[PDB]
Design a protein around this ligand. Structure first.
Ligand SMILES: Nc1ncnc2c1ncn2[C@@H]1O[C@H](C[C@@H](N)CC[C@H](N)C(=O)O)[C@@H](O)[C@H]1O
Ligand SMILES: Nc1ncnc2c1ncn2[C@@H]1O[C@H](C[C@@H](N)CC[C@H](N)C(=O)O)[C@@H](O)[C@H]1O
Lengths: 204, 204
């Protein structure tokens, strides 16, 4: 099996820090940080530029969950969040295609309510890698070594940034497995495209 | 330069027959049929089971538009709809990631408002195929002949149903080019997954 991880993902409950600046409305009734609705209240938020984009996770998961490699039960799926929660997504999860419905599911999971298909734990990215015994880790990034996807089969673990803008940073000395930075294209792609390219390279 | 077509797509202004059963609301203000909001009003609509799913198109287009093969300007992109409209999607279209905003864009286009990146014409699928001079056509369907994605490069035109349930029906006698039915996997996949698999085959 392969592990696929969307890491430092822009999927969080609204940070206490800024709840005071959030005026609630009926157009958006979720406690999930979303820049489309909280852009102002996020102005002085640390790393604001990489937070508040849950649709990156939604769209990527729609791609991952439906991929042949996942239908063949050959994937382990994890969402690691900006604030160090890890969601293990059961391969048979039926993810709502509706964005708001999606937010509703995630809101409950992140608040610790039980979900037999999506397990949540508090955990750093590095600890996750060690506990699943990731051995050869490909960190996907447009600034890594250009690499043909037919070579991706050589790694057992793939990490894709689940965030809008930035670069994925990981503490080498805290990870037992070997980490390699890998680009599969010379332009910046969206996260779900990268997830798709990985999944399909694993089947074909 | 390849043609990719999402065909008989579940993307329509509310059908004349059931307009009287559907009121704009604050929850969903768009004149686009969506069964997540209009399920009951669609009870007695013909082919209801393959209509009212704009999200299939939204997600597929997000995959297509961000694919390397499209960044390299090697795609022509078409949405053919259930009611015989054809939307030509400029490769540089920046499609809203937000579903409702996507609906707002598509609603205007379908109503005939000028959009310089998305052109709309009344047109059947067969007519579309003839106009673009499709010669070697792969119709994707799980029931077709299984074909490793590696071979997709031999065709010039790909057709994927932009609908939830059923099978694409095409009058071959009305089509100049050659049509083969092709399966890329031994299981029903979602349309966006098939689009993605095709797009990535074309680049690797
Ligand atoms: N050309 C690429 N090769 C490998 N991974 C990529 C590529 N483009 C985007 N990604 C992944 O997509 C994630 C989220 C992106 N919105 C950020 C892209 C950013 N330009 C980057 O390469 O880090 C990134 O953190 C990367 O992991
Ligand atoms: N295993 C598959 N191999 C090739 N194309 C597929 C496959 N599964 C779905 N598609 C395409 O995706 C479209 C949308 C589907 N939701 C329809 C599912 C239906 N089971 C079918 O294969 O036709 C279909 O019209 C096909 O064009």
């Amino acid at each position: 099996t392969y592990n696929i991880i969307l890491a430092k993902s822009a999927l969080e409950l609204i940070p206490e820090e800024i709840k005071n600046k959030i005026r609630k409305s009926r157009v958006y009734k979720y406690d999930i940080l979303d820049s489309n609705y909280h852009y102002k209240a996020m102005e002085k938020l640390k790393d604001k530029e990489m937070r508040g984009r849950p649709d990156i996770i939604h769209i990527s998961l729609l791609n991952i969950l439906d991929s042949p490699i996942n239908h063949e039960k050959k994937l382990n799926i994890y969402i690691h969040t900006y604030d160090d929660k890890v969601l293990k997504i059961n391969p048979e999860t039926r993810l709502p295609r509706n964005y708001f419905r999606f937010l509703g599911v995630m809101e409950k999971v992140l608040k610790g309510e039980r979900n037999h298909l999506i397990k949540m734990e508090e955990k750093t990215l590095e600890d996750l890698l060690n506990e699943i015994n990731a051995k050869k880790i490909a960190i996907m990034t447009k600034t890594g070594k250009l690499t043909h996807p037919k070579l991706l089969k050589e790694y057992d673990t793939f990490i894709i940034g689940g965030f809008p803008y930035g670069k994925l940073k990981i503490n080498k000395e805290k990870v037992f497995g070997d980490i390699k930075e890998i680009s599969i294209y010379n332009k910046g792609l969206m996260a779900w495209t990268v997830c798709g390219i990985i999944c399909y390279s694993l089947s074909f």
